[PDB]
Amino acid sequence: TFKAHVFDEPMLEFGDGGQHCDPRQGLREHGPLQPRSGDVIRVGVIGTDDTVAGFTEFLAETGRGIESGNKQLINLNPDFPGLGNQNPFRCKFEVPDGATVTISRRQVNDITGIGRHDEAVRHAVELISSQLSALVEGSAKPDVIVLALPIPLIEKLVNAKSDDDVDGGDMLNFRDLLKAKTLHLPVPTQIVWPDTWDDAAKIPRKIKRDSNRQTQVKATRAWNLLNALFYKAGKVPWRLLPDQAEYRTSFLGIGFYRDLDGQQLWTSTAQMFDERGRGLILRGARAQTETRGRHPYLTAKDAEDLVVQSIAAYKAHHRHVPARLVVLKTSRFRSEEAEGIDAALGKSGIEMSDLVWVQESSPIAIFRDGNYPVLRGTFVDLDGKGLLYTRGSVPFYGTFPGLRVPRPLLLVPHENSDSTILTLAKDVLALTKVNWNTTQFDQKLPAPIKAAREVGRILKHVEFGTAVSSDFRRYT
Amino acid sequence: ITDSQVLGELGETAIKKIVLETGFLYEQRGRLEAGTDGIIELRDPKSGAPLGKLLGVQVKSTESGQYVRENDNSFEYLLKPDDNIPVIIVLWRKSDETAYWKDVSDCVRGEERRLKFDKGTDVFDPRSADRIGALTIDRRTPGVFLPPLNKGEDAIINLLRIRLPDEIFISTSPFGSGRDAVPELVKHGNVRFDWVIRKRRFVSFFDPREYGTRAIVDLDQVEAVDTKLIAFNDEQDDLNDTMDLLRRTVERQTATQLSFLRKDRLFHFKAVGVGKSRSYRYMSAKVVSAYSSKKKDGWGYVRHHAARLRFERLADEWFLVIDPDFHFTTDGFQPHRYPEALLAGKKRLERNAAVRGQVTMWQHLLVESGKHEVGLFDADKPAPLLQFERLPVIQLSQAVPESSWNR
Amino acid sequence: AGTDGIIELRDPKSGAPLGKLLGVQVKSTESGQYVRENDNSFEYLLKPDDLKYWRTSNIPVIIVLWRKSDETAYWKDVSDCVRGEERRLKFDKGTDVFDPRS
RNA sequence: AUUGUACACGGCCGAAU
DNA sequence: ATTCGGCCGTGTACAAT
Ligand SMILES: [Ca+2]
């Protein structure tokens, strides 16, 4: 008595109203949704003189075009066009003179010469942040800064081997600490390992010391990296195509992250809504509340103050409260949360609201007859609980990009929800195509849920009560 | 049975005959779908290897006779809105059987009108060797995908419907939990673990008086009521006992074939003998075997087919989920220390066919378990307390183009 | 402006200029690859502002695509377009070659 | 950390005995 | 102690049959 469904691939919007189901093809034909005023994206580079020169050649190399890494599947592994009429971003990625800061060989030896791994990461962050402050206040003002870490620095910071004895195992993450400690800088930063802009480079894995890491083909790496660079430059590449007769809706994803002590649990939230006109806003905020514990769920007061904050952010762009508010959460909605959220809606006069728990650990799954799994977008209704396959066989790609069979997303709406699960699944599936961190659209999790977790990693190192930018470009 | 089944459905059957002798492939697709009804691929007559070029075909049937504006030069047929990949719109006559193809990659100004198929140059003849082949498209750099336009597929689900007995025995006890009462049970005879104790209450699908559990249960307070008052109720505790009772009943059942890991929640096949291979015989509508409890050939370690059996309540009905997994042992009984490399190695290689076969195996094992042997006391005089049955296949509306993909 | 040149017809026999003008816009690429380019056809996406200018024009306008790598020239009437998208043109490498044969 | 999935391992939380 | 539910965190393998 389970009713099946296969949703069509949601249409994305590019360029001057162009529509396509694939971010790569849509960008290739129509270009970015928000075109830049100017044909150059000034990219600053921080790293050793080898990596700074190495990455700069890579940026020019992408301008000349990169041959596809697998011609058998030309949709899953397409070739980067270049600077022709097929330019995905209609702009030039150049490094202007004076926009490079060189990490001297002496400075690398200071970081590598420290015994304790934690001290090395902290010392490296201060060293990099000082160089980062030099770039922003200089004459050459970049739009996005690329940190091309050298191989010896990656060995010390990531693999920690150059290792000391393990003390608890909660080793600091250099990327998250660096992103948090430079949140006050006005320009977003991007970390790029040498093996992505140079196929010759090889960094061994941390534990498996005898094996290098395996990376995607060069064309795919250029696609994902430059798309992130374009987004961090201050423009939205693509947006979901809006239905003409749709309720003005705001999506709010709620997630949790362990505190640095490893025991307490904080709440990190992300909000998605399209501004008036052709645009899409992705905010990342932490609930300004003091109720500390280990519970992976919110309290009645905590949820109410959180929803009120999200509504106010929406009202700043639209000057009117949203018609619909869809709240996606990584854990089951409890009674205190639902009544807390409903209290916030009543004060703001919100008409309809959906409370959906996006569970990934559900063991329920379906299997078609063959060697490939079910189509992406397959939906099965289980007495209200929705089984959605955001990952699976993609007809556009011609294959299924995964190792084992995909694990479907189980959507469990709370009883205090308006829309049917079929309607919610169509929105959840559509939300997976606006992550902007990758050009491959068969993403498993919806963007508000995913964006909430990405914000959480950075905010573990930001002390509570410190005001930080809500722009998602500083966390992706 | 549609009114057009005689005409529309069987119309495409005769169209394939023209292409069958021509030498071009015809791949079945959706009947009334947007864009294609069949696929044409050019092929080398000498070898038959694929050339990597495709083309779609759409056919719509009509009645016998002529159409609007038909003299002895041409006719005039309209294309309805609901039909990328340019596709030939092949027609079909009934009075004298003259098919009429025409392109859609062609641009005669705006195509938004009536496609007047010429009666002199739109005849679908074996001349299509180079004529139709000129339009065929390729799966190279432009990136033409194969949209799924099919009658869908039949997918199976992990759920098995559980038919609980119409009666359940509920009784009090001077014990709080089963752990507090298991030492009381073991010292007596006729030991049976298929029961649950919580809140000083005793729940079991069998009558406690008949079997050896008389010591724990208050033998004068054994009352049998319908399961709808204990299982299908909103009480959170009652759900938890039903979760406990279902597993233990499944645990005691199938004991001739499976073993339970206490630290985990994993069911796995037990090994007959010591450190030797094994096999199982399960249904598909075909007889299939598989190494359920298999010792390796390269070394002596033993891998047992495993599954995490969990119960869910959907639509006021109880279902059992099957989650395939593996359990590795040095000799079939002692758990294999450091099994991460072996466990992760096998998981990395399985695909949809492998996991589906494992699911069907566990479905067959449980559904056959509820059945009784012909002879009395062959396995147990009372019938198995749980009856499972496969759910009807899930009817997806779209099919994976597995045939079009490699292999 | 919107157009890059004006073509004026002239009778090849008598040499008399017919006086009929024809607007021309030329897009030049260097070793590029048009969107979804097979060995027999490709596509092109017109800018939305170009369409608005061409509609107001009182003379016919053709769009000519020139590639320096292979010295290939293709032409198509701007009003002519794919039935689906107003901004999309489907060029054919056989019939749209820009040359004296056309 | 271009990108994510699958897997493995570990920690922890909610309800009642 | 159990039985049921769940969640977040760090690594390797792989680029998809
Ligand atoms: Ca990123």
Tab-separated table of N, CA, C and O (backbone and C1' of nucleotides) in Angstrom, chain D residues 2-15:
chain	number	residue	atom	x	y	z
D	2	U	P	41.555	20.527	-2.249
D	2	U	O5'	40.094	20.955	-2.711
D	2	U	C5'	39.821	22.279	-3.146
D	2	U	C4'	38.647	22.304	-4.088
D	2	U	C3'	37.454	21.457	-3.670
D	2	U	O3'	36.609	22.118	-2.747
D	2	U	C1'	37.983	21.012	-5.928
D	3	U	P	35.923	21.301	-1.547
D	3	U	O5'	34.973	20.256	-2.282
D	3	U	C5'	33.868	20.696	-3.056
D	3	U	C4'	33.270	19.568	-3.858
D	3	U	C3'	32.712	18.406	-3.057
D	3	U	O3'	31.408	18.661	-2.567
D	3	U	C1'	34.031	17.582	-4.840
D	4	G	P	31.160	18.910	-1.001
D	4	G	O5'	29.706	18.312	-0.751
D	4	G	C5'	29.531	16.985	-0.277
D	4	G	C4'	29.617	15.978	-1.395
D	4	G	C3'	29.262	14.547	-1.023
D	4	G	O3'	27.866	14.329	-1.118
D	4	G	C1'	31.246	14.611	-2.358
D	5	U	P	27.027	13.759	0.123
D	5	U	O5'	26.406	12.406	-0.442
D	5	U	C5'	26.553	11.189	0.266
D	5	U	C4'	27.096	10.099	-0.621
D	5	U	C3'	27.445	8.798	0.080
D	5	U	O3'	26.310	7.970	0.251
D	5	U	C1'	29.211	9.432	-1.374
D	6	A	P	25.903	7.435	1.708
D	6	A	O5'	26.542	5.979	1.764
D	6	A	C5'	26.373	5.072	0.687
D	6	A	C4'	27.570	4.166	0.542
D	6	A	C3'	28.098	3.565	1.833
D	6	A	O3'	27.369	2.421	2.239
D	6	A	C1'	29.898	4.439	0.572
D	7	C	P	27.112	2.134	3.797
D	7	C	O5'	28.508	1.574	4.316
D	7	C	C5'	29.102	0.434	3.713
D	7	C	C4'	30.575	0.349	4.022
D	7	C	C3'	30.946	0.343	5.496
D	7	C	O3'	30.795	-0.930	6.097
D	7	C	C1'	32.328	1.872	4.342
D	8	A	P	30.378	-1.046	7.643
D	8	A	O5'	31.737	-0.776	8.426
D	8	A	C5'	32.890	-1.566	8.175
D	8	A	C4'	34.128	-0.928	8.749
D	8	A	C3'	34.037	-0.501	10.204
D	8	A	O3'	34.255	-1.572	11.103
D	8	A	C1'	34.966	1.254	8.924
D	9	C	P	33.500	-1.603	12.521
D	9	C	O5'	34.278	-0.521	13.393
D	9	C	C5'	35.666	-0.663	13.657
D	9	C	C4'	36.275	0.628	14.143
D	9	C	C3'	35.639	1.241	15.380
D	9	C	O3'	36.065	0.636	16.588
D	9	C	C1'	35.929	2.914	13.747
D	10	G	P	35.049	0.521	17.827
D	10	G	O5'	34.986	2.002	18.410
D	10	G	C5'	36.150	2.624	18.932
D	10	G	C4'	35.969	4.112	19.100
D	10	G	C3'	34.850	4.558	20.026
D	10	G	O3'	35.200	4.478	21.396
D	10	G	C1'	34.798	5.842	18.044
D	11	G	P	34.055	4.331	22.513
D	11	G	O5'	33.451	5.800	22.645
D	11	G	C5'	34.260	6.886	23.071
D	11	G	C4'	33.576	8.209	22.835
D	11	G	C3'	32.221	8.386	23.500
D	11	G	O3'	32.314	8.755	24.864
D	11	G	C1'	32.069	9.046	21.245
D	12	C	P	31.217	8.233	25.915
D	12	C	O5'	29.896	9.038	25.528
D	12	C	C5'	29.846	10.450	25.655
D	12	C	C4'	28.695	11.048	24.883
D	12	C	C3'	27.298	10.718	25.383
D	12	C	O3'	26.914	11.491	26.506
D	12	C	C1'	27.370	10.485	23.033
D	13	C	P	25.751	10.969	27.486
D	13	C	O5'	24.406	11.327	26.712
D	13	C	C5'	24.092	12.672	26.386
D	13	C	C4'	22.894	12.761	25.475
D	13	C	C3'	21.605	12.162	26.012
D	13	C	O3'	20.921	13.031	26.900
D	13	C	C1'	21.950	11.424	23.795
D	14	G	P	20.023	12.427	28.086
D	14	G	O5'	18.634	12.089	27.383
D	14	G	C5'	17.862	13.112	26.770
D	14	G	C4'	16.736	12.534	25.949
D	14	G	C3'	15.821	11.559	26.672
D	14	G	O3'	14.823	12.207	27.440
D	14	G	C1'	16.465	10.640	24.594
D	15	A	P	14.394	11.618	28.871
D	15	A	O5'	13.486	10.358	28.515
D	15	A	C5'	12.129	10.520	28.125
D	15	A	C4'	11.413	9.194	28.074
D	15	A	C3'	11.613	8.290	29.282
D	15	A	O3'	10.717	8.608	30.333
D	15	A	C1'	11.884	7.045	27.272
